[PDB]
């Protein structure tokens, strides 16, 4: 009876900025989602780093999932890539997958 579709992002990752060595975490929300994982600078992030929260929104009908990942100062300064420390998020569904905004940590 429920409608099946691709994951639609509610809270897309916004560009974070490190201040006085205080680690700031990134926010991500998608629906319909069952598995949410981050892809930092072209490569996947470990499962232990991800903190899942499947909070059902009173407004929306389908299942909502929220995952947070911490980005420390040490992870940024040791990174010697060509572009800035960009973070992208991918959500899973019964039909396919969808990608969100590239949030750059500076």
């Amino acid at each position: 009876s429920a409608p099946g579709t691709l994951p639609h992002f509610i809270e897309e990752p916004e560009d974070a900025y490190i201040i006085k060595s205080n680690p700031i975490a990134l926010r991500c929300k998608a629906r319909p989602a069952m598995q949410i994982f981050f892809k930092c600078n072209g490569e996947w992030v470990h499962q232990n780093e991800h903190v899942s929260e499947e909070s059902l929104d009173e407004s929306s009908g389908l299942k909502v999932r929220e995952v947070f990942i911490n980005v420390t100062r040490q992870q940024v300064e040791d990174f010697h890539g060509p572009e800035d420390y960009w973070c992208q998020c991918v959500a899973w569904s019964h039909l396919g997958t969808s990608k969100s905004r590239k949030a750059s940590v500076r």
């Binding site: 072209g42 490569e43 499962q47 039909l95 396919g96 997958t97 990608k99």
Partner: protein
């Protein structure tokens, strides 16, 4: 010869020209076609490109695609479709390229559901296949029978089915590194049916012990790094009589059961750096084995972590005959 594109001898250069569609004026004497780093979409593909039989290599990496391209040249062997956004793969789009051998699909948005049932199997001459840095939850079922090199690494694979590796008897190299795979996720004797397998690597995964039932008929290289292996069973390495390279470094191993490397006669190298090797009575076989080992086999990585008295030391040499142990 097109106006916007500048051709050179037997090559066509459409790369980095901000094109949204493939040019019309394509000669019948061109071998390699370059169309990479453009804004070419799945809809912007003329059918006259399919008629050009002379073209065998096509480059379309770093573009803005959504599905596998249609009306690609009829006699193409190598195809490059990486760093774009292909989500869907279809049976009809691969039936047009019957002579396709090498195929690259890296950094794409390829999902397990998006891929049509037996789409890859339609391309009968396909030997080399690359599905790296994609969003694959598992291994597809419809895989070519004559497929030689299957690379499906850096994805989100947690489960592998026994029927997923069917008819792939002629596969040599199999790469599945950088996934959320586990010993529960792997089926009972799924890799055992691949007799022609020469290389197998599962590095940066979550494996609690090496996968049971592996082919020892043609296997030479076996890589198992950054996993959570607690122990290795006696049957896990048995019958692998043709193995030359073995690597079990960056694991969580304390003690190895004696007679585990007894069936590996052809072994030319073994790597076990960074491991919490608790040195007790169980390491007395390792020290002796390393002493009278032939020059042809190198073994490095064995270093003591526990206790504090023998901490940091090398398993290769014993002091005062392993203390009061014998």
């Amino acid at each position: 010869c097109p106006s916007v594109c500048r051709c050179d001898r037997n090559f066509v250069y459409c790369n980095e020209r901000s094109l949204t569609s493939v040019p019309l004026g394509i000669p019948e004497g061109v071998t390699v076609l370059y169309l990479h780093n453009n804004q070419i979409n799945n809809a912007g593909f003329p059918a006259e490109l399919h008629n050009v039989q002379s073209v065998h290599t096509v480059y379309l990496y770093g573009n803005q695609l959504d599905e596998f391209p249609m009306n690609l040249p009829k006699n193409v062997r190598v195809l490059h479709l990486q760093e774009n956004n292909i989500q869907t793969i279809s049976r009809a789009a691969l039936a047009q390229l019957l002579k396709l051998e090498e195929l690259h699909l890296d950094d794409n948005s390829i999902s397990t559901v998006g891929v049509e049932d037996g789409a890859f199997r339609e391309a009968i001459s396909l030997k080399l296949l690359f599905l790296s840095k994609n969003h694959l939850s598992s291994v597809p079922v419809g895989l070519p029978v004559d497929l030689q090199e299957l690379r499906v690494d850096e994805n989100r694979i947690a489960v592998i089915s026994d029927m997923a590796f069917q008819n792939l008897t002629s596969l040599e190299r199999l790469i599945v590194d950088g996934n959320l795979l586990t010993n529960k996720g792997i089926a009972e004797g799924t890799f055992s049916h691949l007799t022609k397998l020469k290389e197998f690597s599962i590095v940066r995964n979550s494996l609690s012990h090496p996968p049971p039932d592996l082919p020892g008929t043609h296997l030479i290289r076996l890589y198992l790094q950054d996993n959570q292996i607690n122990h290795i069973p006696l049957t896990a390495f048995a019958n692998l009589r043709k193995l030359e390279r073995l690597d079990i470094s960056n694991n969580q191993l304390r003690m190895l059961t004696q007679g585990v490397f007894d069936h590996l006669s052809n072994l030319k190298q073994l790597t076990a750096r960074n491991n919490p090797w608790f040195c007790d009575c169980s390491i007395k076989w390792v020290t002796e084995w390393l002493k009278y080992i032939p020059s042809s086999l190198n073994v490095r990585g064995f270093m003591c972590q526990g206790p504090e008295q023998v901490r940091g030391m090398a398993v290769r040499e014993l002091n005062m005959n392993l203390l009061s142990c014998p």
